[PDB]
Design an enzyme around this catalytic site. Structure first.
Site, PDB file in Angstrom:
ATOM      1  N   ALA A  25     -10.982  20.325  12.997  1.00  0.00           N
ATOM      2  CA  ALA A  25     -11.364  21.360  13.839  1.00  0.00           C
ATOM      3  C   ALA A  25      -9.876  22.395  13.839  1.00  0.00           C
ATOM      4  O   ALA A  25     -10.193  23.685  13.190  1.00  0.00           O
ATOM      5  CB  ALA A  25     -11.781  21.441  15.111  1.00  0.00           C
ATOM      6  N   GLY A  27      -7.728  22.500  11.312  1.00  0.00           N
ATOM      7  CA  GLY A  27      -7.154  22.871   9.706  1.00  0.00           C
ATOM      8  C   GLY A  27      -7.137  21.649   9.088  1.00  0.00           C
ATOM      9  O   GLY A  27      -8.154  20.995   9.268  1.00  0.00           O
ATOM     10  N   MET A  28      -6.033  21.816   8.084  1.00  0.00           N
ATOM     11  CA  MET A  28      -5.899  20.803   7.188  1.00  0.00           C
ATOM     12  C   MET A  28      -4.286  20.411   7.238  1.00  0.00           C
ATOM     13  O   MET A  28      -3.595  21.280   7.509  1.00  0.00           O
ATOM     14  CB  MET A  28      -6.332  21.197   5.747  1.00  0.00           C
ATOM     15  CG  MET A  28      -5.921  20.674   4.565  1.00  0.00           C
ATOM     16  SD  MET A  28      -6.387  21.368   2.963  1.00  0.00           S
ATOM     17  CE  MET A  28      -8.216  20.386   3.278  1.00  0.00           C
ATOM     18  N   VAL A  29      -3.980  19.176   6.906  1.00  0.00           N
ATOM     19  CA  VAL A  29      -3.029  18.765   6.918  1.00  0.00           C
ATOM     20  C   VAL A  29      -2.673  17.745   5.681  1.00  0.00           C
ATOM     21  O   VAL A  29      -3.245  17.084   5.115  1.00  0.00           O
ATOM     22  CB  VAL A  29      -2.647  17.603   8.298  1.00  0.00           C
ATOM     23  CG1 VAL A  29      -3.412  16.148   8.104  1.00  0.00           C
ATOM     24  CG2 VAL A  29      -1.294  17.344   8.598  1.00  0.00           C
ATOM     25  N   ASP A 139      -4.231  15.190  27.024  1.00  0.00           N
ATOM     26  CA  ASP A 139      -5.300  14.710  26.185  1.00  0.00           C
ATOM     27  C   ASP A 139      -4.588  13.463  25.571  1.00  0.00           C
ATOM     28  O   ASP A 139      -4.560  13.341  24.243  1.00  0.00           O
ATOM     29  CB  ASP A 139      -5.646  15.796  25.205  1.00  0.00           C
ATOM     30  CG  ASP A 139      -6.912  15.399  24.500  1.00  0.00           C
ATOM     31  OD1 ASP A 139      -7.598  14.438  24.956  1.00  0.00           O
ATOM     32  OD2 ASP A 139      -7.382  16.289  23.437  1.00  0.00           O
TER      33      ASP A 139
HETATM   34  C1  LIG Z   1      -8.232  20.888  17.322  1.00  0.00           C
HETATM   35  O1  LIG Z   1      -8.242  22.553  17.303  1.00  0.00           O
HETATM   36  C2  LIG Z   1      -7.034  23.176  17.317  1.00  0.00           C
HETATM   37  C3  LIG Z   1      -5.864  22.212  17.317  1.00  0.00           C
HETATM   38  C4  LIG Z   1      -4.564  22.690  17.186  1.00  0.00           C
HETATM   39  C5  LIG Z   1      -3.412  22.013  17.462  1.00  0.00           C
HETATM   40  C6  LIG Z   1      -2.504  22.342  18.641  1.00  0.00           C
HETATM   41  O2  LIG Z   1      -3.504  21.856  19.652  1.00  0.00           O
HETATM   42  N1  LIG Z   1      -3.504  20.724  17.344  1.00  0.00           N
HETATM   43  C7  LIG Z   1      -3.392  19.926  16.092  1.00  0.00           C
HETATM   44  O3  LIG Z   1      -2.864  20.272  15.088  1.00  0.00           O
HETATM   45  C8  LIG Z   1      -3.515  18.406  16.320  1.00  0.00           C
HETATM   46  C9  LIG Z   1      -4.940  17.934  16.466  1.00  0.00           C
HETATM   47  N2  LIG Z   1      -3.006  17.524  15.059  1.00  0.00           N
HETATM   48  C10 LIG Z   1      -3.728  17.331  13.888  1.00  0.00           C
HETATM   49  C11 LIG Z   1      -2.917  16.586  13.145  1.00  0.00           C
HETATM   50  C12 LIG Z   1      -2.914  16.060  11.880  1.00  0.00           C
HETATM   51  C13 LIG Z   1      -1.833  15.351  11.307  1.00  0.00           C
HETATM   52  C14 LIG Z   1      -0.620  15.091  12.069  1.00  0.00           C
HETATM   53  C15 LIG Z   1       0.433  14.392  11.602  1.00  0.00           C
HETATM   54  N3  LIG Z   1       0.136  13.256  10.853  1.00  0.00           N
HETATM   55  C16 LIG Z   1       1.190  12.620  10.477  1.00  0.00           C
HETATM   56  N4  LIG Z   1       0.671  11.285   9.632  1.00  0.00           N
HETATM   57  C17 LIG Z   1      -0.385  10.834   9.528  1.00  0.00           C
HETATM   58  C18 LIG Z   1      -0.805   9.859  10.561  1.00  0.00           C
HETATM   59  C19 LIG Z   1      -2.366   9.231  10.379  1.00  0.00           C
HETATM   60  O4  LIG Z   1      -2.109   8.565   9.327  1.00  0.00           O
HETATM   61  C20 LIG Z   1      -1.793   9.347   8.169  1.00  0.00           C
HETATM   62  C21 LIG Z   1      -0.388  10.055   8.248  1.00  0.00           C
HETATM   63  N5  LIG Z   1       2.746  12.696  10.592  1.00  0.00           N
HETATM   64  C22 LIG Z   1       2.876  13.767  11.228  1.00  0.00           C
HETATM   65  C23 LIG Z   1       1.830  14.753  12.000  1.00  0.00           C
HETATM   66 CL1  LIG Z   1       2.189  16.027  12.625  1.00  0.00          CL
HETATM   67  C24 LIG Z   1      -0.464  15.818  13.345  1.00  0.00           C
HETATM   68  C25 LIG Z   1      -1.665  16.434  13.824  1.00  0.00           C
HETATM   69  C26 LIG Z   1      -1.791  17.416  15.308  1.00  0.00           C
HETATM   70  O5  LIG Z   1      -0.987  17.264  15.966  1.00  0.00           O
HETATM   71  C27 LIG Z   1      -4.389  24.191  17.083  1.00  0.00           C
HETATM   72  C28 LIG Z   1      -5.808  24.978  17.175  1.00  0.00           C
HETATM   73  N6  LIG Z   1      -7.066  24.376  17.287  1.00  0.00           N
END
Ligand SMILES: COc1cc([C@@H](CO)NC(=O)[C@@H](C)N2Cc3ccc(-c4nc(NC5CCOCC5)ncc4Cl)cc3C2=O)ccn1
Length: 335
Positions: A25, A27-29, A139
């Site tokens: 939700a 976006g994309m990473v 959370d």
């Molecule tokens: C849900 O609606 C939202 C949400 C948000 C915002 C602020 O609340 N929330 C996020 O963005 C949350 C949900 N996420 C999503 C995410 C995805 C990847 C990584 C990440 N992942 C990795 N490594 C991977 C680990 C697994 O295995 C594969 C490698 N390393 C470093 C990082 Cl920061 C971190 C995050 C993170 O914080 C803003 C607006 N609307």
């Protein structure tokens, strides 16, 4: 621009060589090669402006992560944001790349007791700092606990965080919530707005139980099924526990259920360390005034191999078109 899977990822030329990691939700990473630090990073594309609750989450997270500095809390290294206001439909938030999270870890790997003791240390170490800034994560769950290759742990997603408001915590029965269901403390479903630090301690206790067996402890399927699960393990609350619930709808709901006995932790968790379960007992305490605090949990004998207060830092100081502008104003320090 650069592209990923039929999707723009316009992260300038500082970040090249994108690899898709995931999506949801938010976006994309991607992972991307940072051409100025010479290390691959995580970048996430947040397109929040379609609805104001997502813009709140993006501003909350940005404000908190730029102010927090702590080894067990993910930071923000960059924000790549189109150089004029109207050109800004997305914010690209750049953070350290981590190998996995605890959610994916629990689904594939048995943890040894030494890994459980260490991940718990690092969660509470980071939480000690969050709470010392008068903030609540609200959370905590395994997917918000990131890990590198040597099992160093960083807490992520600060978009649901709030400032603590213990004095305005009370509310009615079955009043709606937004922390994730398996990790929601019982008082949320009964008479809490989740504005006290104890809400986080409950979620850390749930994560601890889940590390001991790889299964969620309280796997509810809906809002009120969650409390059935909690009471199925913790038992019927004590008269004292009940009498702290003055709200009559929540009081009489609890009086209405048949008596349930406490499931002893050591039968639920037969291979678990006994000190671990004593701590788990204190983090999954029904009454949130009786629940263990973060500085106390850190001093628990389970964690005595790591417990060092002087190496467990605290914060230097505690805490719509206008959200869209405040997101703009807050992210300008990276141009
Ligand atoms: C849900 O609606 C939202 C949400 C948000 C915002 C602020 O609340 N929330 C996020 O963005 C949350 C949900 N996420 C999503 C995410 C995805 C990847 C990584 C990440 N992942 C990795 N490594 C991977 C680990 C697994 O295995 C594969 C490698 N390393 C470093 C990082 Cl920061 C971190 C995050 C993170 O914080 C803003 C607006 N609307």
């Amino acid at each position: 621009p650069e592209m990923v899977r039929g999707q723009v990822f316009d992260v300038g030329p500082r970040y090249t060589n994108l690899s898709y990691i995931g999506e949801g939700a938010y976006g994309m990473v991607c992972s991307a090669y940072d051409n100025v630090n010479k290390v691959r990073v995580a970048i996430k594309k947040i397109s929040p402006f379609e609805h104001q609750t997502y813009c709140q989450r993006t501003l909350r997270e940005i404000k908190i992560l730029l102010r927090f500095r702590h080894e067990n809390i993910i930071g923000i290294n960059d924000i790549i944001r189109a150089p004029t206001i109207e050109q800004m439909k997305d914010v690209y938030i750049v953070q350290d790349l981590m190998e996995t999270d605890l959610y994916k870890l629990l689904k594939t790997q048995h943890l040894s007791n030494d890994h459980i003791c260490y991940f718990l240390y690092q969660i509470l170490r980071g939480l000690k700092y969050i709470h010392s800034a008068n903030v609540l994560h609200r959370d905590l769950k395994p997917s918000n606990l990131l890990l590198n290759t040597t099992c160093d742990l960083k807490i992520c997603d600060f978009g649901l965080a709030r400032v603590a408001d213990p004095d305005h915590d009370h509310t009615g029965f079955l009043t709606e919530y937004v922390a994730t269901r398996w990790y929601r403390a019982p008082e949320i479903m009964l008479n809490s707005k989740g504005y006290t630090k104890s809400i986080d301690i409950w979620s850390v206790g749930c994560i601890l139980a889940e590390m001991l067996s790889n299964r969620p402890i309280f796997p509810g399927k809906h809002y009120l099924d969650q409390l059935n699960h909690i009471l199925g393990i913790l038992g019927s609350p004590s008269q004292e526990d009940l009498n702290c619930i003055i709200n009559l709808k929540a009081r009489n709901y609890l009086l209405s259920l048949p008596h349930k006995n406490k499931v002893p932790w050591n039968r639920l968790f037969p291979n678990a360390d006994s000190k671990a379960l004593d701590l788990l007992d204190k983090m999954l305490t029904f009454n949130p005034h009786k629940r263990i605090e973060v500085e106390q949990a850190l001093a628990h004998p389970y964690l005595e191999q790591y417990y060092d207060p002087s190496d467990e830092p605290i914060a230097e100081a505690p805490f719509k078109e206008k959200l869209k502008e405040l997101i703009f104003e807050e992210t300008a320090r990276f141009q």
